[PDB]
Protein backbone atom coordinates (compact mmCIF):
# COMPACT_ATOMS: atom_id res chain seq x y z
CA UNK A 1 0.00 0.00 0.00
CA UNK A 2 2.26 2.84 1.65
CA UNK A 3 4.44 1.80 -2.06
CA UNK A 4 2.07 2.06 -4.62
CA UNK A 5 0.54 5.80 -4.16
CA UNK A 6 0.57 5.24 -8.15
CA UNK A 7 -3.31 5.61 -7.99
CA UNK A 8 -3.44 2.48 -7.25
CA UNK A 9 -5.45 2.72 -4.09
CA UNK A 10 -9.23 2.36 -5.38
CA UNK A 11 -8.31 -1.46 -6.45
CA UNK A 12 -6.16 -2.10 -3.44
CA UNK A 13 -9.11 -0.54 -1.46
CA UNK A 14 -11.95 -2.85 -2.59
CA UNK A 15 -9.33 -5.36 -1.87
CA UNK A 16 -8.54 -4.35 1.95
CA UNK A 17 -11.71 -3.84 2.61
CA UNK A 18 -12.96 -7.67 1.64
CA UNK A 19 -10.31 -8.18 4.66
CA UNK A 20 -10.94 -5.43 6.84
CA UNK A 21 -15.22 -5.96 6.73
CA UNK A 22 -15.01 -8.90 8.47
CA UNK A 23 -11.73 -9.20 10.79
CA UNK A 24 -12.60 -6.59 13.29
CA UNK A 25 -13.76 -9.26 15.96
CA UNK A 26 -10.61 -10.86 15.54
CA UNK A 27 -9.56 -13.23 18.46
CA UNK A 28 -5.80 -11.56 18.99
CA UNK A 29 -4.33 -8.64 19.45
CA UNK A 30 -1.30 -7.07 16.96
CA UNK A 31 -3.46 -8.36 14.38
CA UNK A 32 -5.87 -5.74 15.07
CA UNK A 33 -3.89 -3.11 16.38
CA UNK A 34 -1.84 -3.36 13.02
CA UNK A 35 -5.05 -3.36 11.31
CA UNK A 36 -5.68 -0.17 13.19
CA UNK A 37 -3.00 1.41 12.41
CA UNK A 38 -3.47 0.88 8.73
CA UNK A 39 -6.79 1.94 8.00
CA UNK A 40 -5.82 4.57 10.02
CA UNK A 41 -3.00 6.35 8.19
CA UNK A 42 -4.74 4.68 4.42
CA UNK A 43 -7.33 7.18 5.55
CA UNK A 44 -5.67 9.76 6.72
CA UNK A 45 -4.47 9.36 3.14
CA UNK A 46 -7.50 8.47 1.50
CA UNK A 47 -10.44 10.72 0.04
CA UNK A 48 -12.20 8.81 -2.08
CA UNK A 49 -15.58 8.42 -0.83
CA UNK A 50 -13.55 5.24 0.83
CA UNK A 51 -13.62 7.43 3.90
CA UNK A 52 -16.98 6.13 5.13
CA UNK A 53 -16.69 2.26 4.97
CA UNK A 54 -13.33 2.50 6.39
CA UNK A 55 -14.62 4.82 9.19
CA UNK A 56 -17.24 2.55 10.03
CA UNK A 57 -14.60 -0.48 10.17
CA UNK A 58 -12.77 2.31 12.84
CA UNK A 59 -16.45 2.62 14.23
CA UNK A 60 -16.83 -1.27 15.38
CA UNK A 61 -13.19 -1.13 16.80
CA UNK A 62 -14.13 1.42 18.51
CA UNK A 63 -17.14 -0.31 20.33
CA UNK A 64 -14.72 -3.47 20.31
CA UNK A 65 -14.06 -3.10 23.28
CA UNK A 66 -15.59 -1.25 26.64
CA UNK A 67 -13.55 -1.95 29.66
CA UNK A 68 -12.32 -4.78 31.69
CA UNK A 69 -15.55 -6.95 32.76
CA UNK A 70 -14.40 -9.70 34.69
CA UNK A 71 -13.25 -9.09 38.48
CA UNK A 72 -11.33 -12.84 38.26
CA UNK A 73 -8.30 -10.60 36.65
CA UNK A 74 -7.24 -8.20 38.54
CA UNK A 75 -3.96 -7.86 39.60
CA UNK A 76 -4.11 -11.13 37.68
CA UNK A 77 -4.53 -9.56 33.77
CA UNK A 78 -5.04 -6.38 34.37
CA UNK A 79 -1.83 -5.97 32.50
CA UNK A 80 -2.77 -8.31 30.16
CA UNK A 81 -6.59 -7.53 29.33
CA UNK A 82 -4.94 -3.75 29.19
CA UNK A 83 -2.38 -4.66 26.80
CA UNK A 84 -5.48 -5.95 24.68
CA UNK A 85 -7.21 -2.60 25.24
CA UNK A 86 -4.18 -1.21 23.64
CA UNK A 87 -5.56 -1.93 20.11
CA UNK A 88 -8.71 0.37 20.73
CA UNK A 89 -6.22 3.14 22.39
CA UNK A 90 -3.87 3.42 19.49
CA UNK A 91 -7.12 3.26 17.38
CA UNK A 92 -8.72 6.47 19.18
CA UNK A 93 -5.16 8.27 19.07
CA UNK A 94 -4.96 7.66 14.94
CA UNK A 95 -8.23 8.39 14.72
CA UNK A 96 -7.50 12.17 16.83
CA UNK A 97 -4.64 12.16 13.87
CA UNK A 98 -7.01 11.75 11.60
CA UNK A 99 -9.59 14.61 13.01
CA UNK A 100 -6.69 17.02 12.85
CA UNK A 101 -5.43 16.46 9.25
CA UNK A 102 -7.93 15.14 7.38
CA UNK A 103 -10.55 18.27 8.67
CA UNK A 104 -8.57 21.05 6.33
CA UNK A 105 -10.20 19.24 2.96
CA UNK A 106 -13.20 20.18 1.21
CA UNK A 107 -16.20 17.65 1.71
CA UNK A 108 -17.11 18.56 5.72
CA UNK A 109 -19.22 15.67 6.43
CA UNK A 110 -15.45 13.75 6.66
CA UNK A 111 -14.30 15.96 9.50
CA UNK A 112 -18.02 16.37 10.70
CA UNK A 113 -18.76 12.49 11.37
CA UNK A 114 -15.30 12.24 12.72
CA UNK A 115 -15.68 14.83 15.86
CA UNK A 116 -19.27 13.55 16.05
CA UNK A 117 -17.99 10.05 16.43
CA UNK A 118 -15.24 10.77 18.99
CA UNK A 119 -18.14 12.59 20.99
CA UNK A 120 -19.89 10.15 21.25
CA UNK A 121 -17.65 7.12 22.25
CA UNK A 122 -15.88 9.37 24.96
CA UNK A 123 -19.72 10.18 26.06
CA UNK A 124 -20.80 6.54 26.00
CA UNK A 125 -17.23 6.07 27.78
CA UNK A 126 -18.41 8.14 30.80
CA UNK A 127 -21.59 6.46 30.63
CA UNK A 128 -20.21 2.97 31.57
CA UNK A 129 -17.60 4.44 33.72
CA UNK A 130 -14.54 2.86 32.85
CA UNK A 131 -11.94 2.41 34.95
CA UNK A 132 -8.60 0.94 33.32
CA UNK A 133 -5.59 3.12 33.15
CA UNK A 134 -6.29 2.77 29.37
CA UNK A 135 -9.13 4.53 29.29
CA UNK A 136 -7.85 7.64 32.07
CA UNK A 137 -4.69 8.27 28.98
CA UNK A 138 -7.20 7.77 26.76
CA UNK A 139 -9.88 10.75 28.04
CA UNK A 140 -6.17 12.36 28.68
CA UNK A 141 -5.43 12.79 25.22
CA UNK A 142 -8.78 12.91 24.16
CA UNK A 143 -9.88 16.06 26.29
CA UNK A 144 -6.27 17.76 25.87
CA UNK A 145 -6.79 17.85 22.10
CA UNK A 146 -10.41 18.73 21.89
CA UNK A 147 -9.71 21.55 24.04
CA UNK A 148 -7.59 23.31 22.04
CA UNK A 149 -10.76 24.32 19.32
CA UNK A 150 -10.46 27.40 19.24
CA UNK A 151 -12.39 30.06 16.68
CA UNK A 152 -11.13 32.96 14.58
CA UNK A 153 -13.91 33.90 12.61
CA UNK A 154 -17.14 34.20 14.11
CA UNK A 155 -19.00 31.07 13.48
CA UNK A 156 -18.10 27.77 13.64
CA UNK A 157 -15.12 27.87 12.62
CA UNK A 158 -13.13 25.54 15.44
CA UNK A 159 -9.41 25.58 14.88
CA UNK A 160 -6.87 23.74 16.43
CA UNK A 161 -3.20 23.99 15.43
CA UNK A 162 0.66 22.13 16.26
CA UNK A 163 3.52 24.51 16.52
CA UNK A 164 1.40 27.47 14.49
CA UNK A 165 -0.91 30.07 15.99
CA UNK A 166 -3.80 28.26 13.74
CA UNK A 167 -4.50 26.89 10.44
CA UNK A 168 -7.77 27.09 8.97
CA UNK A 169 -10.82 24.94 7.84
CA UNK A 170 -14.28 26.57 7.96
CA UNK A 171 -16.08 24.07 6.28
CA UNK A 172 -21.07 22.78 10.21
CA UNK A 173 -19.28 21.42 13.64
CA UNK A 174 -21.28 22.54 16.82
CA UNK A 175 -20.09 22.93 19.82
CA UNK A 176 -22.82 21.77 22.68
CA UNK A 177 -21.55 18.24 22.63
CA UNK A 178 -18.20 19.66 24.27
CA UNK A 179 -20.71 21.07 26.99
CA UNK A 180 -22.04 18.19 27.74
CA UNK A 181 -18.92 15.74 27.53
CA UNK A 182 -17.41 18.21 29.85
CA UNK A 183 -20.38 18.39 32.62
CA UNK A 184 -19.94 14.57 32.44
CA UNK A 185 -16.22 14.77 33.10
CA UNK A 186 -17.05 17.15 36.11
CA UNK A 187 -20.17 15.02 37.28
CA UNK A 188 -18.42 11.20 36.96
CA UNK A 189 -14.55 11.64 36.81
CA UNK A 190 -12.65 9.81 39.12
CA UNK A 191 -9.56 10.69 38.72
CA UNK A 192 -7.56 13.90 39.31
CA UNK A 193 -5.06 14.57 36.54
CA UNK A 194 -8.22 14.38 33.74
CA UNK A 195 -9.52 17.06 35.60
CA UNK A 196 -6.94 19.43 36.44
CA UNK A 197 -6.31 19.56 32.66
CA UNK A 198 -9.59 20.51 31.67
CA UNK A 199 -10.17 22.82 34.57
CA UNK A 200 -6.89 24.29 33.84
CA UNK A 201 -7.41 24.91 29.89
CA UNK A 202 -11.19 25.74 30.44
CA UNK A 203 -10.90 29.49 30.76
CA UNK A 204 -8.89 30.86 28.02
CA UNK A 205 -11.35 28.45 25.76
CA UNK A 206 -14.72 30.55 27.69
CA UNK A 207 -12.49 33.58 26.74
CA UNK A 208 -13.50 32.59 23.20
CA UNK A 209 -17.10 33.59 23.85
CA UNK A 210 -18.20 32.97 20.18
CA UNK A 211 -18.24 29.37 20.64
CA UNK A 212 -20.10 29.12 23.46
CA UNK A 213 -22.89 31.83 22.24
CA UNK A 214 -22.97 29.52 18.72
CA UNK A 215 -24.13 26.17 19.68
CA UNK A 216 -26.93 25.57 22.91
CA UNK A 217 -24.75 26.44 25.57
CA UNK A 218 -26.94 26.78 28.70
CA UNK A 219 -23.78 27.39 30.59
CA UNK A 220 -25.51 28.22 34.08
CA UNK A 221 -25.99 24.69 34.21
CA UNK A 222 -22.21 23.83 34.63
CA UNK A 223 -22.02 26.61 37.23
CA UNK A 224 -24.26 24.90 39.63
CA UNK A 225 -21.87 21.78 39.17
CA UNK A 226 -18.98 23.91 39.97
CA UNK A 227 -20.91 25.13 42.95
CA UNK A 228 -21.71 21.60 43.82
CA UNK A 229 -18.21 20.49 42.63
CA UNK A 230 -16.86 23.16 45.66
CA UNK A 231 -19.89 23.37 47.88
CA UNK A 232 -20.22 19.77 49.51
CA UNK A 233 -17.40 17.24 50.13
CA UNK A 234 -19.82 14.98 47.28
CA UNK A 235 -16.60 15.74 45.01
CA UNK A 236 -13.42 14.97 46.96
CA UNK A 237 -14.64 11.49 47.15
CA UNK A 238 -13.50 10.92 43.15
CA UNK A 239 -9.75 9.96 43.49
CA UNK B 1 12.00 85.49 50.29
CA UNK B 2 9.13 84.65 53.23
CA UNK B 3 5.80 85.84 51.67
CA UNK B 4 7.54 84.52 47.91
CA UNK B 5 7.79 81.26 49.74
CA UNK B 6 4.29 81.13 51.20
CA UNK B 7 2.86 82.57 47.62
CA UNK B 8 4.62 79.36 45.58
CA UNK B 9 3.00 77.18 48.65
CA UNK B 10 -0.37 78.50 47.93
CA UNK B 11 0.54 77.83 43.54
CA UNK B 12 0.59 73.86 44.66
CA UNK B 13 -3.12 72.49 44.87
CA UNK B 14 -4.76 70.82 47.89
CA UNK B 15 -5.94 68.08 45.98
CA UNK B 16 -4.31 64.71 44.41
CA UNK B 17 -3.05 65.09 41.22
CA UNK B 18 -3.03 62.53 37.95
CA UNK B 19 -2.75 63.02 34.27
CA UNK B 20 -3.28 59.87 31.55
CA UNK B 21 -2.22 60.06 28.29
CA UNK B 22 -5.35 58.25 26.13
CA UNK B 23 -4.58 56.64 22.69
CA UNK B 24 -5.90 55.38 19.85
CA UNK B 25 -3.87 52.65 17.74
CA UNK B 26 -5.96 50.94 14.76
CA UNK B 27 -5.55 47.64 13.08
CA UNK B 28 -2.29 47.85 10.73
CA UNK B 29 -0.76 50.88 13.18
CA UNK B 30 0.84 48.74 15.06
CA UNK B 31 4.18 49.13 15.84
CA UNK B 32 3.61 52.72 13.46
CA UNK B 33 4.53 55.10 16.53
CA UNK B 34 3.57 57.80 14.07
CA UNK B 35 0.30 56.60 12.52
CA UNK B 36 -0.78 55.79 16.37
CA UNK B 37 0.05 59.70 17.33
CA UNK B 38 -1.20 61.09 14.43
CA UNK B 39 -4.63 59.11 14.17
CA UNK B 40 -8.05 60.71 14.24
CA UNK B 41 -11.33 59.51 14.26
CA UNK B 42 -10.73 56.22 16.18
CA UNK B 43 -12.76 53.84 16.24
CA UNK B 44 -16.78 53.90 17.36
CA UNK B 45 -16.66 51.54 19.92
CA UNK B 46 -13.27 53.28 21.25
CA UNK B 47 -14.81 57.02 20.84
CA UNK B 48 -18.14 55.32 22.87
CA UNK B 49 -16.46 53.55 26.12
CA UNK B 50 -14.55 57.39 25.77
CA UNK B 51 -17.39 59.37 26.13
CA UNK B 52 -18.23 57.63 29.50
CA UNK B 53 -15.49 58.91 30.93
CA UNK B 54 -16.15 61.11 33.93
CA UNK B 55 -16.64 65.01 33.19
CA UNK B 56 -14.70 67.56 30.79
CA UNK B 57 -14.42 71.30 30.83
CA UNK B 58 -13.72 73.37 27.40
CA UNK B 59 -10.24 75.18 28.18
CA UNK B 60 -11.25 79.36 27.45
CA UNK B 61 -12.08 81.86 29.60
CA UNK B 62 -14.79 79.77 31.21
CA UNK B 63 -12.99 77.12 32.51
CA UNK B 64 -9.76 79.25 35.13
CA UNK B 65 -6.52 77.64 36.08
CA UNK B 66 -8.37 75.70 39.26
CA UNK B 67 -8.38 72.16 36.74
CA UNK B 68 -5.19 71.85 35.37
CA UNK B 69 -5.21 73.70 32.48
CA UNK B 70 -1.82 72.49 30.29
CA UNK B 71 -1.74 73.27 27.01
CA UNK B 72 -4.29 76.23 26.64
CA UNK B 73 -3.86 75.95 23.04
CA UNK B 74 -6.94 73.88 21.61
CA UNK B 75 -10.26 70.57 22.96
CA UNK B 76 -13.07 68.50 25.02
CA UNK B 77 -10.07 67.17 27.13
CA UNK B 78 -12.26 64.59 29.46
CA UNK B 79 -10.91 64.97 33.31
CA UNK B 80 -12.15 62.80 35.64
CA UNK B 81 -12.57 64.62 38.95
CA UNK B 82 -13.23 64.35 42.48
CA UNK B 83 -12.30 66.65 46.00
CA UNK B 84 -9.92 64.20 47.11
CA UNK B 85 -8.19 63.17 43.55
CA UNK B 86 -7.75 65.12 40.19
CA UNK B 87 -7.14 62.94 37.06
CA UNK B 88 -6.98 64.94 33.86
CA UNK B 89 -6.27 63.08 30.34
CA UNK B 90 -4.56 65.58 29.01
CA UNK B 91 -3.85 63.79 25.39
CA UNK B 92 -6.35 62.11 23.55
CA UNK B 93 -6.19 61.38 19.65
CA UNK B 94 -8.66 64.73 19.98
CA UNK B 95 -5.86 66.60 20.98
CA UNK B 96 -4.07 68.13 17.55
CA UNK B 97 5.21 70.44 22.57
CA UNK B 98 2.41 68.69 21.91
CA UNK B 99 4.92 65.32 20.65
CA UNK B 100 6.47 65.90 24.34
CA UNK B 101 2.89 66.77 25.73
CA UNK B 102 2.00 62.93 25.49
CA UNK B 103 5.41 61.18 25.74
CA UNK B 104 5.67 62.49 28.93
CA UNK B 105 2.56 61.07 30.83
CA UNK B 106 3.67 58.25 33.15
CA UNK B 107 1.03 55.94 32.54
CA UNK B 108 -1.62 55.66 28.85
CA UNK B 109 -4.47 53.67 28.22
CA UNK B 110 -4.36 52.60 24.68
CA UNK B 111 -7.23 51.23 22.89
CA UNK B 112 -6.04 47.76 20.89
CA UNK B 113 -8.11 47.81 17.94
CA UNK B 114 -6.12 45.17 16.24
CA UNK B 115 -4.61 42.13 16.58
CA UNK B 116 -1.67 41.47 19.16
CA UNK B 117 -0.80 44.77 18.37
CA UNK B 118 1.48 46.20 21.07
CA UNK B 119 4.16 45.72 23.20
CA UNK B 120 5.65 48.41 25.58
CA UNK B 121 8.78 48.69 23.38
CA UNK B 122 6.36 49.87 20.72
CA UNK B 123 6.12 53.43 22.27
CA UNK B 124 8.87 55.63 22.61
CA UNK B 125 7.47 57.01 25.35
CA UNK B 126 10.02 57.76 28.13
CA UNK B 127 7.97 58.53 30.69
CA UNK C 1 -29.67 63.55 27.16
CA UNK C 2 -31.02 59.97 26.69
CA UNK C 3 -31.35 60.42 22.91
CA UNK C 4 -27.50 60.07 22.88
CA UNK C 5 -27.67 56.56 24.71
CA UNK C 6 -30.53 55.78 22.12
CA UNK C 7 -28.10 57.33 19.45
CA UNK C 8 -25.12 54.94 20.82
CA UNK C 9 -28.02 52.33 21.26
CA UNK C 10 -29.12 53.12 17.82
CA UNK C 11 -25.74 52.61 16.13
CA UNK C 12 -25.36 49.57 17.97
CA UNK C 13 -27.77 47.77 16.30
CA UNK C 14 -26.09 48.86 12.79
CA UNK C 15 -22.43 48.72 12.44
CA UNK C 16 -22.46 45.35 14.76
CA UNK C 17 -25.49 43.84 12.58
CA UNK C 18 -23.52 45.33 9.15
CA UNK C 19 -19.78 44.32 10.76
CA UNK C 20 -20.86 40.70 11.02
CA UNK C 21 -22.29 40.72 8.03
CA UNK C 22 -18.90 42.07 6.46
CA UNK C 23 -17.00 39.09 8.44
CA UNK C 24 -19.31 36.73 6.73
CA UNK C 25 -18.41 37.87 2.97
CA UNK C 26 -14.57 37.77 4.51
CA UNK C 27 -14.93 34.60 5.55
CA UNK C 28 -16.09 33.33 2.30
CA UNK C 29 -13.34 35.30 0.41
CA UNK C 30 -10.71 33.12 2.85
CA UNK C 31 -11.97 29.81 1.80
CA UNK C 32 -11.64 30.33 -2.03
CA UNK C 33 -8.00 31.15 -1.38
CA UNK C 34 -7.45 27.77 0.07
CA UNK C 35 -8.66 25.65 -1.83
CA UNK C 36 -6.75 27.37 -5.12
CA UNK C 37 -3.62 26.52 -3.16
CA UNK C 38 -4.55 22.64 -2.61
CA UNK C 39 -6.09 22.24 -6.00
CA UNK C 40 -1.95 23.72 -7.35
CA UNK C 41 -0.88 21.25 -4.56
CA UNK C 42 -2.84 19.07 -6.84
CA UNK C 43 -2.00 19.53 -10.41
CA UNK C 44 1.68 19.57 -9.25
CA UNK C 45 1.74 15.97 -7.55
CA UNK C 46 -0.56 14.35 -9.98
CA UNK C 47 1.59 15.83 -13.38
CA UNK C 48 5.38 14.77 -11.48
CA UNK C 49 3.39 11.57 -10.72
CA UNK D 1 -22.66 69.78 21.32
CA UNK D 2 -22.10 66.05 22.83
CA UNK D 3 -18.55 66.20 21.70
CA UNK D 4 -18.70 68.19 18.59
CA UNK D 5 -20.95 64.90 17.34
CA UNK D 6 -18.24 62.23 18.22
CA UNK D 7 -20.63 59.92 17.79
CA UNK D 8 -22.35 60.73 14.31
CA UNK D 9 -18.72 61.12 12.69
CA UNK D 10 -17.23 57.23 13.61
CA UNK D 11 -20.56 55.98 12.62
CA UNK D 12 -20.47 57.38 9.00
CA UNK D 13 -16.41 56.22 8.92
CA UNK D 14 -17.90 53.39 10.02
CA UNK D 15 -20.33 53.06 7.18
CA UNK D 16 -17.71 54.51 4.68
CA UNK D 17 -15.09 51.54 5.85
CA UNK D 18 -17.72 48.92 5.13
CA UNK D 19 -19.14 50.07 1.87
CA UNK D 20 -15.49 50.26 0.24
CA UNK D 21 -14.48 46.70 1.85
CA UNK D 22 -17.66 45.32 1.03
CA UNK D 23 -17.08 45.72 -2.77
CA UNK D 24 -13.54 44.87 -2.86
CA UNK D 25 -14.16 41.59 -0.93
CA UNK D 26 -16.52 41.22 -3.75
CA UNK D 27 -14.32 41.73 -6.35
CA UNK D 28 -12.41 39.43 -5.29
CA UNK D 29 -14.37 36.69 -3.87
CA UNK D 30 -15.49 36.23 -7.77
CA UNK D 31 -12.23 36.62 -9.07
CA UNK D 32 -11.20 33.34 -6.48
CA UNK D 33 -14.37 31.44 -7.52
CA UNK D 34 -13.77 32.18 -11.36
CA UNK D 35 -9.88 30.42 -10.64
CA UNK D 36 -11.78 28.06 -8.55
CA UNK D 37 -13.64 26.31 -11.68
CA UNK D 38 -10.70 26.84 -14.32
CA UNK D 39 -8.42 24.33 -11.62
CA UNK D 40 -11.73 22.20 -12.06
CA UNK D 41 -11.44 21.70 -15.39
CA UNK D 42 -7.49 21.39 -15.92
CA UNK D 43 -7.38 18.43 -13.23
CA UNK D 44 -10.50 16.23 -14.94
CA UNK D 45 -8.20 16.61 -18.07
CA UNK D 46 -4.97 15.18 -15.83
CA UNK D 47 -6.53 12.28 -14.27
CA UNK D 48 -8.50 11.20 -17.59
CA UNK D 49 -4.49 11.40 -18.87
Known sequence: LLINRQF??????????????SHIP?????????????????????????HFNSLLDIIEKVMARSLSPPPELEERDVAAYSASLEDVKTAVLGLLVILQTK????????????????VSHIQLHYKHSYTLPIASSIRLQAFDFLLLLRADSLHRLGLPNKDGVVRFSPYSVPYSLLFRVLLQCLKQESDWKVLKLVLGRLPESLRYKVLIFTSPCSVDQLCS???????GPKTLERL | SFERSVQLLDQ????????????????????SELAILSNEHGSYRYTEFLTGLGRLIELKDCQPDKVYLGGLDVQFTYC???????????????????????????????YNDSGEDFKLGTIKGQF | ?????????AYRKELEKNRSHV???????????????????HLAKKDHL
Open chain 1, 8 to 21: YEEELINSVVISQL
Open chain 1, 26 to 50: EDKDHQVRKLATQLLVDLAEGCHTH
Open chain 1, 103 to 118: LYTLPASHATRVYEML
Open chain 1, 225 to 231: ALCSMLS
Open chain 2, 12 to 31: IPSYDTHKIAVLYVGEGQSN
Open chain 2, 80 to 110: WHDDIMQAVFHIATLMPDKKRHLGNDFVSIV
Open chain 3, 1 to 9: TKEVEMMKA
Open chain 3, 23 to 41: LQQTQRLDTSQKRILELES
